[PDB]
Amino acid sequence: TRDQNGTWEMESNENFEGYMKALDIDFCTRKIAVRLTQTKVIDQDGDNFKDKTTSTFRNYDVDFTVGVEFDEYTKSLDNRHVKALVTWEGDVLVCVQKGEKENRGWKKWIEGDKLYLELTCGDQVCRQVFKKK
Amino acid sequence: TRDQNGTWEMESNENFEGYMKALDIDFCTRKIAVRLTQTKVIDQDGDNFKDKTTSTFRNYDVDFTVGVEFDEYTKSLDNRHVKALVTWEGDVLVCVQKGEKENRGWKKWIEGDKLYLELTCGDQVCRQVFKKK
Numbered sequence A, B: 001t002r003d004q005n006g007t008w009e010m011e012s013n014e015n016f017e018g019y020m021k022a023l024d025i026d027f028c029t030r031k032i033a034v035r036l037t038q039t040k041v042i043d044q045d046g047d048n049f050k051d052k053t054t055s056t057f058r059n060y061d062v063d064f065t066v067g068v069e070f071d072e073y074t075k076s077l078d079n080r081h082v083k084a085l086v087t088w089e090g091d092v093l094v095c096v097q098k099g100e101k102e103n104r105g106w107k108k109w110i111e112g113d114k115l116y117l118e119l120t121c122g123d124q125v126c127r128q129v130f131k132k133k
Helices: A016-022 A027-033 B016-022 B027-032
Strands: A006-014 A038-045 A048-065 A070-073 A081-089 A092-098 A105-111 A114-121 A124-132 B006-014 B037-045 B048-065 B070-073 B081-089 B092-098 B105-111 B114-121 B124-132
Touching (some): A016 A027, A016 B124, A027 B027, A027 B048, A048 A070, A114 B016, A124 B037, B016 B027, B048 B070
Antiparallel strands (some): A006 A038, A006 B124, A048 B048, A070 A081, A114 A124, A124 B006, B092 B105, B114 B124
């Protein structure tokens, strides 16, 4: 049929690397994208189309209670075993992950309407700002 | 404020590559982890936290109209300007993208339940099969 609406999930994918190299796509995204399941959402009204193909890289679910340490396996990242503890520093949610790497943790606080997250490891600090949806 | 409830979407991510160098993450995972989309859903109840973070690769997101040609700019892919034209060949949605690369386009058709799409660039043909959810 001509109706292509719906949420589609990739069953198979052949010659993805060759097609991507034909487009001069670099090697790393070629290796990663071929391992991910693509989900193409298609919204069609007659001859007007809206195609959005997406891919889920990794999911990271963590459950914790403030002041109660827990055995956290940092899966979907570096996959290390750390004992994590989350505490309130005034209004900033601070988490210390005691394990192999030292000075490892994160600080997560709200400012106005934005979410500020600072991931800390040794002498490297990454800043991630989130907008509310 | 300590209320961090809600669904957040990342709009900035600086020094992710350094924080990832500290944790010894795989090379290509670092190279692709600098161009991905992150959504963090936070379910908070006083001090109990249920955090769910999803990393997401954007393969392609496009809107078009059948029979009307348009000037496409393929960011999230190879970042090239192409004159795209989408038509119906029977029940097969054919798309020709005229530009630098020759024989660039795709064919999208439905068979019973499955969605079949043949992307093609030059002499490279990529065939993808999708199942409706």
